[PDB]
């Protein structure tokens, strides 16, 4: 039946990545899945003939019923979103597959959204890990800011963040 | 080569045996360990070779024993307050540290600082129980059987079952 | 819902522990499992033919020390075939990294893999993922424990 | 720190993917890979430190990998000299990646791979979903055209992946 999973880690791992390989997997079992992304514009990634569709919004609610339809829901940066837990268990109660990537924790380590608060509802949960982009030589789970902004909420990539290890975390310059 | 590993799950699905597969795995490789358990109770230091097991209510009562220690094994984590800043200072310190923890209460609500420890560790894997309900399906959730509101509340198969999504609604 | 489970890994990896936590939850689940070595049952034998039909009173079978028996894959399969939940505790490389007994040829027909890693016992500071074999014996066949094997990384081996 | 990492499972289940998303980590990292594909009837190289071989057998590489931080081998499964290949260069400290099918259309081992697992310090079982009944995770490949051949290059038109109830339907 139906169940929450959760892929979480660092940036640059991959988790986008490994969400839509799962997508793929349901497509080519002709199982039909709804795709749902964040308003942030940033580049992305149409190849199959089945049920596929693709939002990009800023609270869940903007999708009213048409998620009723699906029979997987993917969603891509899930932190983002405040409604997310009531969100995927209704829908997991009615028996979706629910599938949610994610930052775990901020640049601060702090939790982001309501992804920990996910934790306890999910049937599955992986945790990816990227390289680190300072020593090129441990497996990363944290990501460093860069610039100097404090707000938690700054859309962005390599050029404002990396993925580090433990001790490179702490590095100070 | 310091770290934080969390091993989490319902009930009933061998989390505690996980980490002491992990802890034996690290005593053939001559690493030295120090588990770390939860109620009103015990220290030890013997079996101390050159060629230990304590039980207690806050991680401050260790004090600094876990410096002498290559590996920490912190089992039912949930139920210490300090244990994000503890398994920290001591990851920080390039110890080992592993938390064998309950993710979620019998309410599904996040259980002790577990959901707020996960940014901070390297690994974390969820094991499954199976659904002690219908059998045939596998269990993520804890289910309480007795009627108590409060959370915590110490127990085993007499007071809480492990279940699947369906199941833990009927 | 039948299938085949396989645990891999070297020696020191806990791969037997592994196999007794699965046996564990399903016991608390109610579910019969029948545990067999090289709502409980336990056998102890040297080929698996050995058993008869004993297996099909059974919901789950665990097989420690997958890699010794001759018969492996067949009964594996036939079991799984008629529903059960064949699960497999084995090394899957010997001492010289070879494949040992039927384990690699079990691959293809398992739903599930987990090779699990050891702490190398030479440099301390490294997963293990191999067998070394401290004592001076060419026969693949040998059963011991720390006194005559370690696990060891790519580089000590 | 150099090791053998292997990605298997059925057809459909993302083991290319999985592969290029260690590509991709690897990458952000600036470490350097070497992606080797197979390819019967062509040969093929390109350069620029990125790089992609289409080639019959690893010994048409030569010594280009030893310039590579990281080498992925996409359809391992084809290629007879496998486990001698990534061997030599695990041991020169390379960090090696195979994506193979484990077996065949009809399970028996395919190529070295089952005998490349001793060898491999991590071993990940990717699965499918089940393209007969849809209501279940898929661990084999069924064939769905009349060829005894093992070999027989192709997709979704000549291959499905299944359960285990499934495949004998
Ligand atoms: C589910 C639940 C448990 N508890 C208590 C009762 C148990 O003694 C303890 C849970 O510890 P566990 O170690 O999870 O108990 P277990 O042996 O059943 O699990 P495992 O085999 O995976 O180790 O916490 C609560 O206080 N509140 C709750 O909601
Ligand atoms: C390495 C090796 C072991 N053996 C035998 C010796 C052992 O008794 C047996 C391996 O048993 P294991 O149970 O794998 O050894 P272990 O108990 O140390 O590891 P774990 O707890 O992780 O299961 O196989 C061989 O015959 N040839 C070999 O090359
Ligand atoms: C099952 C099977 C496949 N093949 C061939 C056909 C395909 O081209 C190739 C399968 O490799 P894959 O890369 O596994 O096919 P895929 O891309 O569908 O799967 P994934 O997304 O997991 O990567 O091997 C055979 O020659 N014989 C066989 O029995
Ligand atoms: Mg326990
Ligand atoms: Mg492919
Ligand atoms: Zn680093
Ligand atoms: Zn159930
Ligand atoms: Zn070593
Ligand atoms: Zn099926």
């Known amino acids: 039946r139906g169940r929450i999973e959760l892929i979480i880690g660092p940036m640059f791992a991959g988790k986008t990545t490994e969400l839509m390989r799962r997508v793929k997997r349901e497509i080519h079992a002709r199982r039909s899945c709804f795709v749902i992304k964040y308003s942030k514009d940033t580049r992305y990634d149409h190849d199959q003939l089945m049920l596929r569709a693709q939002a990009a919004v800023s609270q869940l609610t903007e999708v009213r019923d048409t998620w009723k339809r699906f029979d997987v829901l993917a969603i891509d940066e899930g932190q983002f979103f405040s409604d997310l837990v009531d969100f995927c268990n209704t829908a997991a109660d009615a028996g979706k ?4 990537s994610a930052l775990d924790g901020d640049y601060r380590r702090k939790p ?12 599955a949960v992986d945790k990816l890990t990227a390289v680190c982009m300072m020593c090129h030589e441990q497996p990363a789970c944290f990501t460093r800011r860069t610039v100097n902004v404090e707000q938690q909420e700054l859309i962005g990539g390599a050029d404002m963040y990396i993925a580090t290890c433990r001790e490179c975390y702490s590095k100070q310059q």
């Open 112 to 123: 982001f959204g309501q992804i920990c608060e996910l934790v306890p509802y999910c049937e």
């Open 97 to 100: 597959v629910v599938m949610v």
